[PDB]
From a paper:
S3E-LysoPS is an analogue of sn-3-type 18:1 LysoPS, with an ethoxy group at the sn-1 position. Local refinement with the mask of the receptor improved local resolution of the extracellular half of the receptor, and the resulting cryo-EM maps allowed modelling of the entire complexes, including agonists. S3E-LysoPS fits into this cleft, oblique to the receptor. The head group and the acyl chain of S3E-LysoPS fit within the hydrophilic and hydrophobic pockets, respectively. The head group of S3E-LysoPS fits into the pocket, with a U-shaped conformation. The phosphate group engages in electrostatic interactions with the positively charged residues, R1102.60, R208ECL2, and K210ECL2, but does not form direct interactions, such as hydrogen bonds. Moreover, the carboxylate of the serine moiety forms a direct salt bridge with R2866.55 and hydrogen bonds with Y1353.33 and N3097.35. The amine group forms an electrostatic interaction with E3107.36 and a hydrogen bond with the backbone carbonyl group of F205ECL2. The acyl chain of S3E-LysoPS is bent at the cis-9 double bond and fits along the L-shaped pocket. Moreover, R2866.55A mutation abolishes agonist response, whereas alanine mutations of R208ECL2, N3097.35, and E3107.36 reduced potency by ~10–30-fold.
Residue numbers in the entry: 45 to 342
């Protein structure tokens, strides 16, 4: 290996992940309470948000093991089993979050731009179907990768999450390439969905047929682009560098490349978990009723 100094990396990762842990924990607990407590009835969007809250709660649950490993001595005291379990559950949660984000955007685009009257709220059915399908497929992929790693591989060690070349497991390289291309497709769908939502609300505000509360359309138009840009800044960096990460991880290379690649990936993961901790606060603020509840309570 090439052991370059990483005390500053350890400190920044520990503090960032601890802040993300506390913020995402409080955000996701309050979000779960407001999705099961004060929402006796659920809509498709509320179902998808509840599942994003669950996925993110599991990501904040994954965080403390990462902070322990990074702060203790940058050494992994537990077995290779727990290493692979946490390292796989984290990515499982991230890509479940991203798929559910895409699904919310798609339903908002079918609800806002093209819906003329309503849908008679028959949407919770296929909402629960799609959420259960995606969760089961994600459990399938997570267990597949964890069993293909724990037994088929020959390499286990006493340190975790560190940079390891995937020449020992090319299946993981191809799995990550598949995941990156599908994330870019999902983000293309999100960008189409939210751009079209903003444009439709902008034109409707431009006509302004009915004078009363015609400005709420401006607020919603800004909110569409806000959530698109937050998702764009919190995810596109990581998945844009991941192509270079895979390309470097499956060829002969010097170590100096390896330190910069590893530390870039650490910062990008800090960003990704930052999104997973923001999203509940985003739903708290963007909803009129919840924002009024918070403002009158605070
Ligand atoms: C329609 C098909 C969609 C397919 C996915 C279904 C939903 C998603 C379900 C769960 C993802 C499971 C984890 C996948 C891991 C991909 C990323 C990756 O390569 O992580 C590797 C793990 C180690 O895994 C064993 C080889 O990395 P770590 O060692 O935990 O961290 C190393 C490094 N810090 C890094 O993360 O690059």
């Amino acid at each position: 290996t090439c052991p370059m100094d990483e005390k500053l990396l350890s400190t920044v990762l520990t503090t960032s992940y601890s802040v993300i842990f506390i913020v995402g924990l409080v955000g996701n607990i309050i979000a779960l309470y407001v999705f099961l407590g004060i929402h006796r009835k659920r809509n498709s969007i509320q179902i998808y948000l509840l599942n994003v809250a669950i996925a993110d709660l599991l990501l904040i649950f994954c965080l403390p093991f990462r902070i322990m490993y990074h702060i203790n001595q940058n050494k992994w005291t537990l077995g290779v089993i727990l290493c692979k379990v946490v390292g796989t559950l984290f990515y499982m949660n991230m890509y479940i979050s991203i798929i559910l984000l895409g699904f919310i955007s798609l339903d908002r685009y079918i609800k806002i731009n093209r819906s003329i009257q309503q849908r008679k709220a028959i949407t919770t059915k296929q909402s629960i179907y799609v959420c259960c399908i995606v969760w089961m497929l994600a459990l399938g992929g997570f267990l597949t990768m964890i069993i293909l790693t724990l037994k088929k591989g020959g390499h286990n060690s006493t340190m975790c999450f560190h940079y390891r070349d995937k020449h020992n497991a090319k299946g993981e390289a191809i799995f990550n390439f598949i995941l990156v291309v599908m994330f870019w497709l999902i983000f293309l769908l999100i960008i189409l969905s939210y751009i079209k939502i903003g444009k439709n609300l902008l034109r409707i505000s431009k006509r302004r047929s009915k004078f009363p509360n015609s400005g709420k359309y401006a607020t919603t138009a800004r909110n569409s682009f806000i959530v698109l840009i937050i998702f764009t800044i919190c995810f596109v960096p990581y998945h844009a560098f991941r192509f270079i990460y895979i390309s470097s991880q499956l060829n002969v290379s010097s170590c100096y490349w390896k330190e910069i690649v590893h530390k870039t990936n650490e910062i990008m993961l800090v960003l990704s978990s930052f999104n997973s901790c923001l999203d509940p606060v985003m739903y708290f603020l963007m909803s009129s009723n919840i924002r009024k509840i918070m403002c009158q309570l605070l």
